[PDB]
């Protein structure tokens, strides 16, 4: 349905999937880390003058079973693939996450996906150069946006940009 | 509805019930055959669990 956009947060443990979701949902941020099992949210928003609902599934970066992960990925319409700019290993992990999304969505030509480099407020701790992350997004044919769940930088942008991709795909079918 | 309990024991009991439903949904969905109705029910159960866990705190 064009009235409901199903977004999945994907990425390694501790990158800020939940922090981005909760900043977008409720305008809150806390530094306390609680690893996620699986959480979900729904919000009414206005996208380009149109009243829509966004559903967000916030996945575990430390997930136990591949079958559980695959069930979540299969149900999504678009994906925020998140890494922390302060953790190179979280950036390299995004390749395998994307592979898993592609495999579960086997017969879809192009999957709505945005690459999100979170924790932009910790520039002094950056381990992932902007050029490296952007070049990877270009190789995947997707956009790269840097966010901070703490300062709100680009948080609304990533959710709304992905919704626009989901909309464009939905209007092509 | 499911968010109506006000005791820690009652909220925990509703969490245990929703997690049971969630596990049963995953068992059904792990066959890999598309089922948008069951996927929608799974997201709803997760929304309820998320709401319950916030009430629990
Ligand atoms: N400075 C800063 N800290 C952030 C940012 N986003 C998240 N954090 C912090 O990083 C930690 C991990 O955040 P969290 O959202 O729980 O990560 P997650 O990806 O959901 N982890 P998991 O997969 O285990 O659920 C928390 O301590 C959180 O406050 C950000 O943009 N800036
Ligand atoms: Mg989380």
Residue numbers in the entry:
A (entry chain A): 11 to 183
B (entry chain D): 388 to 444
What does the paper say about this structure?
Ral GTPases have been implicated as critical drivers of cell growth and metastasis in numerous Ras-driven cancers. Upon association with and activation by Ras·GTP, RalGDS activates the Ral (Ras-like) small GTPases, RalA, and RalB. The Ral GTPases share a panel of effectors including RLIP76 (also called RalBP1), members of the exocyst complex (Sec5 and Exo84), and the transcription factor ZONAB. Our solution structure of the RBD of RLIP76 in complex with RalB revealed that the interaction is mediated by a well-structured coiled-coil domain in which more than 80% of the interactions with Ral are mediated by the C-terminal α2 helix.
The tightest binding sequences, termed HLR (E427H/Q433L/K440R) and SMLR (E427S/L429M/Q433L/K440R), displayed affinities of 5 and 3 nM for RalA, respectively, a vast improvement on the wild-type RBD affinity of around 100 nM. We obtained high-quality crystals for both the RalB/RLIP76 RBD HLR and SMLR mutant complexes, which diffracted to 1.5 Å resolution. ITC revealed that the Q433L mutation was the key driver for improved affinity, resulting in a ∼20 to 30-fold improvement in affinity compared with the wild-type RBD. Crystal structures of the HLR and SMLR mutant RBDs in complex with RalB revealed that this leucine side chain is able to sustain a network of hydrophobic interactions involving Ral and RBD residues. The mutant RBD structures show that the side chain of Leu433 contributes to a hydrophobic network of interactions involving several Ral residues (Ala48, Leu67, Tyr82) and Trp430 of RLIP76. In the wild-type RBD complex, Gln433 points out to the solvent, leaving a space at the edge of the hydrophobic pocket where Trp430 is buried in an interaction known to be essential for the binding affinity. When the Gln is replaced by Leu, the side chain shifts toward the pocket and fills this space. Lys440 forms a hydrogen bond with RalB Asp49 in the wild-type complex and this interaction has been shown to be critical for binding to Ral, as alanine replacement reduced the affinity tenfold. Replacement with arginine in the HLR and SMLR mutants allows this hydrogen bond to be maintained while an additional hydrogen bond with the backbone carbonyl of RalB Ala48 is gained. The replacement of Glu427 with histidine or serine breaks a salt bridge formed with RalB without forming any new interactions and ITC data demonstrated that this substitution did not improve binding to Ral proteins.
